[PDB]
Amino acid sequence: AQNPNCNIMIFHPTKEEFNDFDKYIAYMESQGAHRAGLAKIIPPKEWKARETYDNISEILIATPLQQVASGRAGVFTQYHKKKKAMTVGEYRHLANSKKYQTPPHQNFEDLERKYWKNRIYNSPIYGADISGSLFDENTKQWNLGHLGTIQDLLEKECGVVIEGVNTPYLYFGMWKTTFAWHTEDMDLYSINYLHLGEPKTWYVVPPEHGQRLERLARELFPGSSRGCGAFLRHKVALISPTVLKENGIPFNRITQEAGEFMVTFPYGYHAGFNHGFNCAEAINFATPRWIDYGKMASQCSCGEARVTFSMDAFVRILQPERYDLWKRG
Numbered sequence: 040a041q042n043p044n045c046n047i048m049i050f051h052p053t054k055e056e057f058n059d060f061d062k063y064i065a066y067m068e069s070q071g072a073h074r075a076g077l078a079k080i081i082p083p084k085e086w087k088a089r090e091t092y093d094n095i096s097e098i099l100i101a102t103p104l105q106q107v108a109s110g111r112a113g114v115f116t117q118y119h120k121k122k123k124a125m126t127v128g129e130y131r132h133l134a135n136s137k138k139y140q141t142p143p144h145q146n147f148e149d150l151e152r153k154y155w156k157n158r159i160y161n162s163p164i165y166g167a168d169i170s171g172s173l174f175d176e177n178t179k180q181w182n183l184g185h186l187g188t189i190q191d192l193l194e195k196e197c198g199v200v201i202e203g204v205n206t207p208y209l210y211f212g213m214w215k216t217t218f219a220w221h222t223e224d225m226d227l228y229s230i231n232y233l234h235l236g237e238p239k240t241w242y243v244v245p246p247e248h249g250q251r252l253e254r255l256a257r258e259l260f261p262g263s264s265r266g267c268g269a270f271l272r273h274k275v276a277l278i279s280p281t282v283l284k285e286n287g288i289p290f291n292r293i294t295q296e297a298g299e300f301m302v303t304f305p306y307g308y309h310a311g312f313n314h315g316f317n318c319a320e321a322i323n324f325a326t327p328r329w330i331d332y333g334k335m336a337s338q339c340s341c342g343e344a345r346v347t348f349s350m351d352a353f354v355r356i357l358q359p360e361r362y363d364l365w366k367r368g
């Protein structure tokens with residue numbers, strides 16, 4: 040079996056290889072990339088997402104989120120406090136202010152140490168989940184607004200015809216902004232392009248070991264576990280690499296820089312943080328291999344987790360028993 044240690048693999052496609060998206064995902068998996076839960080793809084040198092980022096400041100962040108932590112440095116939750124709307128220009132200025140800016144640091148490792156030491160004592164503001172795209176419409180390769188849809192994948196594979204759409208989201212981050220431990224909706228893939236700015240550090244558990252992370256989470260957040268059979272679906276729990284190591288949880292880490300893609304694979308738990316002001320674009324997608332993961336994706340049982348319009352149809356078709364129980368609940 041390829042990649043038995045489940046290492047994060049890094050790919051350097053040629054421009055010819057960058058034409059067929061589906062084919063290249065399949066190629067990465069033939070090399071065992073999915074076993075890590077996460078892969079990095081460096082686009083060919085000839086490729087560009089768009090001409091410049093000089094004109095993005097008037098994008099609105101309608102609901103910036105202040106990420107307030109509760110708990111200890113290595114085991115905490117975060118909740119999102121809604122803030123008043125601001126433009127990306129205003130947000131960038133805030134990110135760079137003395138209160139919120141990245142501290143002096145020696146390297147990525149030094150900054151990582153500072154993040155896990157000091158994260159809980161600050162409340163950075165995140166512009167997350169903003170529907171839209173920064174890819175030029177003339178960018179024909181790996182344009183996250185031009186991917187085949189999950190609905191069409193299900194139709195091609197299963198003859199299933201359903202409602203729903205599939206569009207990208209923008210993320211404007213700053214130092215210490217955090218994404219909690221999670222897999223994707225329906226344990227889909229995701230693909231994430233870092234358009235500009237400072238890096239994003241990722242942590243990931245191999246899909247074959249996801250239930251080890253779940254078991255630790257149940258131990259570390261016992262009240263939450265009693266309240267919901269899949270509370271990581273709430274996307275508010277953080278566990279540090281030190282605590283993962285202490286508990287023998289298999290994981291890897293990698294830092295994504297501007298101009299690089301990351302792909303998360305079905306049931307690959309991931310978490311991470313931003314180094315400073317940046318902008319990323321991400322979207323979920325499917326392949327034929329995903330369908331078996333979608334049908335057995337664990338779901339929130341308490342109603343706290345958000346379910347998009349499109350996810351409704353996925354649950355209805357792939358998980359009819361869960362759907363029925365949920366709608367009667």
Ligand SMILES: CN1C(=O)C(=O)c2ccccc21
Pocket residue numbers: 338339340341342343344345346354361362364365368
């Ligand atoms: C949020 N949520 C629930 O609360 C539930 O029972 C369920 C089942 C499938 C997908 C989502 C669900």
Ligand SMILES: O=C(O)CNC(=O)C(=O)O
Pocket residue numbers: 210217218229230231303309319321322
């Ligand atoms: O970038 C973020 O804040 C979170 N991104 C993801 O979880 C993803 O792309 O799957």
Ligand code: NI
Pocket residue numbers: 221222223229303309
């Ligand atoms: Ni994700």
Ligand SMILES: [Zn+2]
Pocket residue numbers: 266267268269270272273339340341342343344
């Ligand atoms: Zn729940």
